[PDB]
Amino acid sequence: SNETLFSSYKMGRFDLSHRVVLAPMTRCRALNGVPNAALAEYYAQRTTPGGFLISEGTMVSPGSAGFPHVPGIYSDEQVEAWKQVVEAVHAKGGFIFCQLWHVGRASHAVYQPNGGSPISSTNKPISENRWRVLLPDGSHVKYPKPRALEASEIPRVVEDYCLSALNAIRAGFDGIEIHGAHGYLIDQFLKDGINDRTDQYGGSIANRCRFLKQVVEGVVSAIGASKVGVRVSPAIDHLDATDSDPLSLGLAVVGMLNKLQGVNGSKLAYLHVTQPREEEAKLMKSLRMAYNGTFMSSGGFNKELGMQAVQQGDADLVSYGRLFIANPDLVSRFKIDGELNKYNRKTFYTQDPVVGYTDYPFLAP
Ligand SMILES: Cc1cc2nc3c(=O)[nH]c(=O)nc-3n(C[C@H](O)[C@H](O)[C@H](O)COP(=O)(O)O)c2cc1C
Numbered sequence: 001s002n003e004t005l006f007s008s009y010k011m012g013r014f015d016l017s018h019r020v021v022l023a024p025m026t027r028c029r030a031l032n033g034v035p036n037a038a039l040a041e042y043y044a045q046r047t048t049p050g051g052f053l054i055s056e057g058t059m060v061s062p063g064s065a066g067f068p069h070v071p072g073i074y075s076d077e078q079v080e081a082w083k084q085v086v087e088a089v090h091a092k093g094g095f096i097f098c099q100l101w102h103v104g105r106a107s108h109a110v111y112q113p114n115g116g117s118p119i120s121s122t123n124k125p126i127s128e129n130r131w132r133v134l135l136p137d138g139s140h141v142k143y144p145k146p147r148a149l150e151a152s153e154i155p156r157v158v159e160d161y162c163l164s165a166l167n168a169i170r171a172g173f174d175g176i177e178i179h180g181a182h183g184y185l186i187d188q189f190l191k192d193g194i195n196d197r198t199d200q201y202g203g204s205i206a207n208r209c210r211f212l213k214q215v216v217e218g219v220v221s222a223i224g225a226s227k228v229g230v231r232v233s234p235a236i237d238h239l240d241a242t243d244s245d246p247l248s249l250g251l252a253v254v255g256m257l258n259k260l261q262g263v264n265g266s267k268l269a270y271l272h273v274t275q276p277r278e279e280e281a282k283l284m285k286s287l288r289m290a291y292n293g294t295f296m297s298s299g300g301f302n303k304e305l306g307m308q309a310v311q312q313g314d315a316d317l318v319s320y321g322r323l324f325i326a327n328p329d330l331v332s333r334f335k336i337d338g339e340l341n342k343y344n345r346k347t348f349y350t351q352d353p354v355v356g357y358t359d360y361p362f363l364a365p
Pocket residue numbers: 023024025026027055056057058099101179182231274298299300301319320321322323348349
């Protein structure tokens with residue numbers, strides 16, 4: 001139990017030197033959807049030997065974005081420019097996975113080919129009063145009414161996850177992650193709060209997992225289990241992605257992932273679960289035990305909980321978001337209990353390749 005965020009870890013193929021993971025974070029510095037030297041510097045900065053990083057959500061197809069200047073990886077151009085980023089990470093000995101991200105209904109005509117309707121599991125839009133999509137000009141507008149996918153039209157989207165995945169590896173990524181929550185596409189099929197379907201993709205918790213299963217099994221076949229993570233924060237009501245029973249929803253996801261590992265054999269790279277974030281951390285254990293494999297914690301963490309997450313064996317490898325945004329050398333700072341730069345929301349999603357991106361300074365040598 002004396003293990004900590006600094007205890008080495010074997011994540012299948014990858015030997016991590018610590019449990020500090022760079023959580024996947026969209027930063028919108030990938031102008032026009034293609035990676036560049038800014039993302040290269042950004043990731044290389046936060047890289048450490050045996051350190052695991054997850055890329056900002058990356059488009060798996062045209063129309064799969066819901067934010068400005070997010071990187072894509074479904075094409076050759078995107079792939080080519082991703083290489084520099086990945087190389088900048090590998091040169092520094094880190095591991096990097098490309099998150100598989102499709103925003104589904106959480107998009108806008110502005111991000112859709114031909115200014116069309118983003119797709120989803122449902123036709124219901126993300127309620128306006130609570131959230132709005134952020135357009136490239138910086139304004140915030142209402143999420144539009146999404147067109148529910150046709151049952152048959154689903155295996156296609158899967159192809160996009162497969163190509164993008166195969167591309168990820170082509171660009172050198174050590175693997176990919178499955179962004180299955182936060183109200184995005186896959187989640188819109190998982191959450192009963194969103195999934196108002198009645199066909200072969202909805203209703204029963206099992207069917208609600210069908211899309212995720214097809215994507216995971218689809219990408220796995222394409223690149224191999226241990227090269228795939230599948231983030232699922234079923235207790236996060238982001239973008240109206242609520243669920244009547246999060247704990248039981250996650251167990252179904254876990255079950256499906258355990259079933260996959262039994263047949264497919266090899267274990268997935270990991271299961272990533274954002275805290276549902278008195279009572280603000282008693283529900284991760286269940287999945288953190290129901291699952292046969294490495295469990296990544298995310299959401300609200302700091303060194304304090306990270307250590308307890310590992311130490312008190314609450315959870316394996318832990319990903320960090322905002323703190324990593326503000327601390328390129330988060331691992332070091334954490335490892336020595338040093339100062340932590342403060343993060344600034346204003347530049348979370350701006351396009352400056354520098355300001356709010358590569359500015360947070362490393363500790364004074
Ligand atoms: C600017 C920003 C971008 C994010 N982008 C993504 C993303 O692209 N994919 C994803 O799955 N989660 C994303 N998240 C979820 C966050 O990773 C998670 O809420 C965050 O890491 C928690 O940071 P905090 O608890 O560690 O300090 C993002 C969060 C922020 C703040």
